[PDB]
Amino acid sequence: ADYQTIYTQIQARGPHITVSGEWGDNDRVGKPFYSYWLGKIGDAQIGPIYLGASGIAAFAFGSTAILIILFNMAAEVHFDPLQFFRQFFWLGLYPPKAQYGMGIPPLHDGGWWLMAGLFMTLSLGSWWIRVYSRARALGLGTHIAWNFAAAIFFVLCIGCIHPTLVGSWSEGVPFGIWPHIDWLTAFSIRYGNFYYCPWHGFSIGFAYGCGLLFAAHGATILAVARFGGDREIEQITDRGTAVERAALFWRWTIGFNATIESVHRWGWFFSLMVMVSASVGILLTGTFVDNWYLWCVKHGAAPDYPAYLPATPDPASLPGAPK
């Protein structure tokens, strides 16, 4: 085979050059070290890191959040250290279990949930700023920041916005491995099956889309790596045989192609759209649709199947039923 696409056979070492920012060249932190193993898939060098304010802040809120989360998880196993470690995935920080509408709930029932929520929110933001500022610091464009934005917004939607529009904190996602997942099912059951929500559709489309696209783009570049097609930026400004082939390949197959530059747009667009599509769906849910299946039936989208075993009338609705 061609081994040079899978891993790197002969590794290189030498002096790395620092691009001086607009500001905060000073707030780079740590002794850069190498990993020979890591060097077989990517660059081996691992430090330094930029610090600065946004960072500081993000960590600040982030940690507080984490602390509140974990601490409460411990409190669930009554602080038994052995049990904690065994039961860890099953432990969580839950939102309120009674109906208080949108009132700040008691500490012991959802209160702590809410606090961690707010702090997680704040870290996300601080981080956002990091991403956005750094870009501007180095004279790049802001695309990453905007993609990241959408992601954050979707977190907001399922965290507080949706709860708000229906007006109960009870609808919040809980913190914890298994329990954040149990949420998914509950939430779906409640809103009459999410497979039937169109935005869930869209989203998934775009998500699989990403799969397809990365596999394709990924594969395409490696296929043309022999002509130095991995040098993607010089290819943009001075088109070489590499991407000429890459283009041709796709044109001869699906019958239209991209450019080396624009394929990146497509990917960036699909990525974004996952998060956006999602957000919409979440906003609509509870607010305008109560039961997504029934809704799909009102617009006759829903498939209907004959009975295999005899059809069963609901017993509640019989003459002389109990309760």
């Binding site: 740590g30 905007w146 497979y195 397809l212 390949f249």
Partner: protein
């Protein structure tokens, strides 16, 4: 006809790539989903001995299959093959976003700012998260993430029925129940 089409599609690609003197990575990559299709429509039904175990063709209809299948083990979220696949799905999406953005930022730096260099790509990430995977390898890595969506999942899929018949959560019992700390 489906299988037919798929395979003919994939081979066509091989012919194309031969003609261009490029690598065969693309066709091969396209082989992964084909396999998963085969796994779901062919193998798993063989192993359970009926075609009736496969999924129907129908936009909403197919999802109904997915839905019930998954509740046949009591909460599919816990099936460990699924976990891995899901993780990849997410990482892949995020990563495409970053890769997308990063190229675009360098190319279109705003104003009459000059297009930036490869070093600026590196600097940018080594700032934000303190590591840069490097330009070739991201491509390589993308291909990898993408692919294990199905590669790992395929394990969880095949397992359910032929190799496991209980609810998926019950399976984590192995850990939950190590008698030492039980």
């Amino acid at each position: 006809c489906a299988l037919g089409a798929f395979i003919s599609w994939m081979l066509r690609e091989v012919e194309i790539s031969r003609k261009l003197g490029i690598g065969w990575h693309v066709p091969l990559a396209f082989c992964v989903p084909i396999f998963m299709f085969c796994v779901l429509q062919v193998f798993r039904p063989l192993l359970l001995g009926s075609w009736g175990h496969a999924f129907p063709y129908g936009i909403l209809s197919h999802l109904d299959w997915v839905n019930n299948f998954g509740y046949q083990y009591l909460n599919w979220h816990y099936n460990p093959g699924h976990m891995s696949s899901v993780s990849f799905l997410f990482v892949n999406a995020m990563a495409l976003g970053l890769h997308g953005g990063l190229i675009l930022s360098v190319a279109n730096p705003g104003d009459g700012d000059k297009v930036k260099t490869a070093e600026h790509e590196n600097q940018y990430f080594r700032d934000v998260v303190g590591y840069s995977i490097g330009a070739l390898s991201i491509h390589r890595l993308g291909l990898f993430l993408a692919s294990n969506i199905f590669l790992t999942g395929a394990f969880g899929t095949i397992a359910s029925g032929p190799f496991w018949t209980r609810g998926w959560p019950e399976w984590w019992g192995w850990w939950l129940d190590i008698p030492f700390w039980s």
